């Protein structure tokens, strides 16, 4: 910054090529629907606490 000119190099090797990387991030992505639904319903306890619990009649 402040000492590199804002210009474009003549060579094509200055192109920003995309290369792949790690895969654990995509492990997180693959379970995204499971994690999102679990977060909402269980973590936020929606609609209420007793809905997802195993059903018991009152004494």
């Amino acid at each position: 910054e402040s000492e590199d000119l804002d210009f474009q190099c003549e060579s094509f090797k200055s192109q920003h090529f995309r290369k792949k990387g790690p895969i654990s991030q995509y492990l997180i992505l693959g379970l995204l629907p499971i994690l999102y639904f679990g977060t909402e319903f269980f973590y936020n306890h929606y609609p209420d606490e007793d809905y997802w619990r195993v059903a018991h009649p009152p004494p």
């Binding site: 402040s2 190099c9 060579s11 090797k13 200055s14």
Partner: protein, 49 residues
């Protein structure tokens, strides 16, 4: 030379060989800044090294 952006005809003119300022004799203290704007840590385009 800059092997990724530059050419072999990249020779910096040394500060000795650059043309001296002769247009006027009065000084131009803008290039120093001010004690006020140095104290205030203000960055100006006219005193940027």
């Amino acid at each position: 030379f800059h092997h990724d952006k530059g050419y072999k005809y990249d020779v910096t003119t040394p500060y000795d060989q650059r043309y001296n300022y002769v247009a006027d004799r009065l000084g131009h203290p803008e290039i120093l800044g001010n004690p006020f704007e140095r104290l205030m840590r203000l960055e100006g385009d006219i005193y940027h090294p």
